[PDB]
């Protein structure tokens, strides 16, 4: 019953600059044979995890020497001397001394860039879906950074709880993100109200986009 804590859970990096991830164990990981069995694994999206480090320090075959591991007791660190483009992936720490091993929460690596205010657009449900007896209102938040952002929906100035779903894509080649917020209502409820507004909070200002169907 060991707890593995990775820090931080979201790491913005700059290419050519070092990065480091801390992994802390709830118990001492020293094994009875004098070794410490802590491993560091890399996982790119859509792929299985690939081991980079074993026994805290030893580097696995086929790993560039830019990766290094260090640590003892209950504190360990994975270090990347010069972060490259291919280093953008997930990284996990795993204790292996005590059966059957434990994994940390995991760390996502992304590229640090300047703050970019999003472009906000709003889209009413189409007539065809209104015939289909449902209504969806789509709010688009395009080309922003960082990924943290708040979206609120108001139907006739009433904040909506549930009935909204948010999607974010992976970091693009301009180092920006997007976001789609879809609000679902029945056509009766949609025709029952007049003002529909999407309110966006980010490191720009607070921006609302609205329209009046019925």
């Amino acid at each position: 019953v060991k707890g593995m804590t990775q820090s931080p859970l979201f790491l913005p990096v700059t290419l050519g600059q070092p990065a480091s991830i801390s992994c802390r164990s709830s118990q001492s990981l020293v094994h009875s044979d004098g070794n410490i069995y802590l491993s560091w694994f890399q996982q790119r999206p859509g792929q299985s995890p690939r081991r980079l480090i074993y026994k805290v320090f030893d580097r696995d075959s086929g790993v560039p020497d830019r990766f290094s591991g260090s640590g003892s007791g209950t504190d360990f660190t994975l270090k990347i001397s010069r972060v490259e483009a291919e280093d953008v992936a997930h990284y996990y720490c795993m204790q292996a001394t005590h059966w059957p091993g434990t994994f940390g929460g995991g760390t996502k690596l992304t590229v640090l860039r300047t703050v970019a205010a999003p472009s906000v657009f709003l889209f009413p449900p189409s007539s065809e879906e209104l015939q289909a007896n449902k209504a969806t209102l789509v709010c688009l938040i395009s080309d922003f950074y960082p990924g943290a952002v708040t979206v609120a929906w108001k139907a006739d100035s009433s904040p909506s709880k549930a009935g909204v779903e948010t999607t974010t894509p992976s970091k693009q080649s301009n180092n920006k993100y997007s976001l789609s917020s879809v609000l679902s209502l029945t056509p009766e409820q949609w025709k029952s109200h007049r003002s529909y507004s999407c309110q966006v909070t980010h490191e720009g200002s607070t921006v609302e986009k609205t329209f009046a169907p019925t």
Binding site: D33, G34, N35, Y54, D58
Partner: protein, 377 residues
Amino acid sequence: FLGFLLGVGSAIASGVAVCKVLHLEGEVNKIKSALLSTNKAVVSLSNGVSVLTFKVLDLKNYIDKQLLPILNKQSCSISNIETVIEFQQKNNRLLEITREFSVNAGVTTPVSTYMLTNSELLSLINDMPITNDQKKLMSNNVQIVRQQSYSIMCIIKEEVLAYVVQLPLYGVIDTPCWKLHTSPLCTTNTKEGSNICLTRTDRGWYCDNAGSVSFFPQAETCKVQSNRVFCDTMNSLTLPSEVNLCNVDIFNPKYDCKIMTSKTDVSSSVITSLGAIVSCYGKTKCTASNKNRGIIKTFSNGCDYVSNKGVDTVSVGNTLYYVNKQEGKSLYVKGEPIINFYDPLVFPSDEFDASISQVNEKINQSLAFIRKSDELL
């Protein structure tokens, strides 16, 4: 007595084979690579036979991470006495094993605790594909299999020391088994000389294993823990079950009971599991005594047996024997001694590995010699 018939065998042959396979250029590197990231692995050696392998202690990591860096600082500072003690603790494991190996030609039996501790041995027992009955057997008597185990010193190549542990793997368990003790039986005639002695030679352990019985002639080769008799099949004979007939009918035609003949009118005693057999002959004093009451029975010049119930010691002449304090029922079977069925001056008095058929043939041949040289005169 018996045991000259066993035939020779190599006790450490399997471990020798593993060592000879381990004497390859990359075999050390195969073990090193497979154990590079774990403490335990199975390696298929070049001969095709897989072997379980342990990395019980990693002195290289201790020396190259906590001892070597402190030593080289451009100033031989140590800053704390603790380092030498920790060194003498980890080095202690190596020092004891290499000492013991240097006194036993690399073949140490039983396996020491320093060489292979019981916790690792328990893991070794627990992780083999064998019937769980044998797993429990080896688990509850780990020091017994230890005393029936061997050690073989293999190699010291590139950066690792390796040696072979040769455990026994028992294939016959929980089958009927028994021990047979024999004592010299002689004639008790009033004459000083001219005595006749006859003795059964089939002393030892008898274990039924598969259709026949394995016979162990030496009482040393088998260890006993209160129910179970641990034996080695290599120093054993394989005989048909008809040897059992020798206990009831020694003249039986279904088997030939091996015996020996002597003119040695000598008193002796044999302590059995639940009693004692006393062969009292001549003018020797024979006494069965109890610690509370004292002398309780005297032996009247014959092959006798007394139970261990009320008897605690036996003294024959000047020899003091202590009875075993084991518990169990003892059955006395009456019957006239067999030696009275032969007449002297025709009985061959110097036989050592003879049998009922052998002695009877010599007596029949000798009697034919006596008769065919007299019918002619």
